[PDB]
């Protein structure tokens, strides 16, 4: 509570900076952090605009910063706190709607005065509903901030207020299911000279805040996903007596709803991106799609595997997908170009927990080890890690890839 820092100085006195992610992050590079929505984040470097190195408890890597929203609070000083959140959900709205401004006036507007660019169906596909979450949001701060209390600002009522706005972010719903075909009509347009000075005189003819026209249409899908960190931490610091608890609760929930479909969509329709994408970057591909059998990344990290035929240890990089578990190698000194050497089929397999000896099945010398049993035939894989939670957190990996395919 009290008078905030700015972040690169809080990692400058070794200070810790949470945040929590908005969305999920999804990724196979093992040098950047992977997460779910919901997840808590430490900050340890913010030197870049957009991609942070931050700490999970299991590690570690580089995120993107836009994914994620900074804790506002890092004797009746807890109202203190209170007023800060307040605080910073109505600066937030502030903020919002100027870019929602600037889209419609700035973009929108333009736009369609030119009807030999733009077709009323690009219109619809490029900006959406827009229009009508400006509205809405208009309207929505305005109530927002005639609840402001100026004199005690951690008495103000709140939550009523996302309430009785509930069918009105219902409306995100369109907005977020049509922004990836927006997001593919940009990118198009993009590589189209006569729209790239087109929309380089509507920025300066509206002098917009320092973000592209894709980063302005991802403003509402941030928004919309934000709340719910917004209004969680709000209820953090509002006692149960207080005239807006139950109401900041109830609205913590339908909030959370709402955000939980747009963030799982986004999170499917990236996954079966960054799969195809990571494929086409994988050396010596063999063996056909993931695409065909898989729909995501359960869970990646390096494993030991021992040969069969007979028998050595490979260290390789490991990817378990719903169904598949495909292995990598790292090349010599360019740490991120992996080829491929295999892959598992996850439906004929269970997993062994093999606790500490000598092998067995071949040879000896093995630790944090388990075996991938197959049942029908009688094949069998040994695998093993560096260390003792990793072995936990794979054991968990698996059973958590045999739940997905149960009913997926």
């Given at each position: 509570?009290?008078?905030?820092?700015?972040?690169?100085?809080?990692?400058?006195?070794?200070?810790?900076?949470?945040?929590?992610?908005?969305?999920?992050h999804?990724?196979?590079?093992?040098?950047?952090?992977?997460?779910?929505?919901?997840?808590?984040?430490?900050?340890?470097?913010?030197?870049?605009?957009?991609?942070?190195?931050?700490?999970?408890?299991?590690?570690?890597?580089?995120?993107?910063?836009s994914?994620?929203?900074?804790?506002?609070?890092?004797?009746?000083?807890k109202?203190?706190?209170?007023?800060?959140?307040?605080?910073?959900?109505?600066?937030?709205?502030?903020?919002?709607?100027?870019?929602?401004?600037?889209?419609?006036?700035?973009?929108?507007?333009?736009?369609?005065?030119?009807?030999?660019?733009?077709?009323?169906?690009?219109?619809?596909?490029?900006?959406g509903?827009?229009?009508?979450?400006?509205?809405?949001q208009?309207?929505?701060?305005?109530?927002?901030?005639?609840?402001?209390?100026?004199?005690?600002?951690?008495?103000?009522?709140?939550?009523?207020?996302?309430?009785?706005?509930?069918?009105?972010?219902?409306?995100?719903?369109?907005?977020?299911?049509?922004?990836?075909?927006?997001?593919?009509?940009?990118?198009?347009?993009?590589?189209?000279?006569?729209?790239?000075?087109?929309?380089?005189a509507?920025?300066?003819?509206?002098k917009?805040?320092?973000?592209?026209?894709?980063?302005?249409?991802?403003?509402?899908?941030?928004?919309?996903?934000?709340?719910?960190?917004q209004?969680?931490?709000?209820?953090?610091?509002?006692?149960?007596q207080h005239?807006?608890?139950?109401?900041?609760?109830?609205?913590?929930?339908?909030?959370?709803?709402?955000?939980?479909?747009?963030?799982?969509?986004?999170?499917?329709?990236?996954?079966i991106?960054?799969?195809?994408?990571?494929?086409?970057?994988?050396?010596?591909?063999?063996?056909?799609?993931?695409?065909?059998?898989?729909?995501?990344?359960?869970?990646?990290?390096?494993?030991?595997?021992?040969?069969?035929?007979?028998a050595?240890?490979?260290q390789?990089?490991f990817?378990?997908?719903?169904?598949?578990?495909?292995?990598?190698?790292?090349?010599?000194?360019?740490?991120d170009?992996?080829?491929?050497?295999?892959?598992?089929?996850?439906?004929?397999?269970?997993?062994?927990?093999?606790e500490?000896?000598?092998?067995?099945?071949?040879?000896?010398?093995?630790?944090?080890?388990?075996?991938?049993?197959?049942?029908?035939?009688?094949?069998?894989?040994?695998?093993?890690?560096?260390?003792?939670?990793?072995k936990?957190?794979?054991?968990?990996?698996?059973?958590?890839?045999?739940?997905?395919?149960?009913?997926?």
């Amino acid at each position: 509570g009290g008078e905030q820092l700015a972040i690169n100085e809080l990692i400058s006195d070794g200070s810790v900076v949470c945040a929590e992610a908005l969305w999920d992050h999804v990724t196979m590079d093992d040098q950047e952090l992977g997460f779910k929505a919901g997840d808590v984040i430490e900050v340890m470097d913010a030197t870049n605009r957009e991609w942070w190195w931050g700490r999970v408890a299991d590690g570690e890597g580089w995120f993107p910063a836009s994914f994620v929203r900074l804790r506002v609070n890092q004797q009746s000083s807890k109202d203190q706190m209170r007023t800060n959140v307040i605080n910073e959900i109505l600066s937030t709205e502030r903020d919002y709607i100027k870019h929602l401004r600037d889209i419609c006036e700035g973009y929108v507007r333009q736009c369609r005065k030119r009807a030999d660019m733009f077709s009323e169906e690009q219109l619809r596909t490029i900006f959406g509903n827009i229009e009508d979450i400006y509205r809405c949001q208009k309207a929505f701060v305005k109530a927002l901030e005639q609840r402001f209390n100026r004199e005690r600002p951690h008495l103000s009522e709140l939550g009523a207020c996302f309430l009785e706005h509930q069918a009105d972010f219902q409306i995100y719903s369109e907005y977020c299911n049509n922004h990836p075909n927006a997001c593919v009509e940009l990118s198009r347009l993009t590589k189209l000279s006569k729209y790239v000075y087109f929309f380089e005189a509507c920025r300066l003819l509206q002098k917009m805040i320092d973000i592209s026209l894709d980063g302005f249409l991802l403003t509402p899908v941030q928004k919309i996903c934000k709340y719910p960190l917004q209004l969680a931490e709000l209820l953090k610091y509002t006692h149960p007596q207080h005239r807006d608890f139950k109401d900041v609760e109830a609205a913590l929930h339908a909030m959370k709803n709402v955000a939980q479909l747009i963030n799982e969509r986004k999170r499917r329709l990236e996954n079966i991106d960054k799969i195809a994408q990571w494929q086409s970057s994988i050396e010596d591909w063999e063996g056909e799609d993931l695409l065909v059998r898989s729909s995501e990344l359960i869970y990646s990290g390096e494993l030991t595997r021992v040969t069969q035929p007979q028998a050595k240890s490979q260290q390789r990089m490991f990817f378990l997908f719903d169904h598949q578990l495909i292995y990598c190698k790292k090349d010599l000194l360019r740490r991120d170009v992996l080829y491929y050497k295999g892959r598992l089929d996850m439906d004929g397999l269970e997993v062994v927990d093999l606790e500490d000896g000598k092998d067995r099945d071949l040879h000896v010398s093995i630790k944090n080890a388990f075996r991938l049993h197959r049942g029908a035939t009688g094949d069998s894989h040994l695998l093993c890690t560096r260390k003792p939670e990793q072995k936990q957190r794979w054991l968990k990996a698996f059973a958590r890839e045999r739940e997905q395919v149960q009913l997926d």
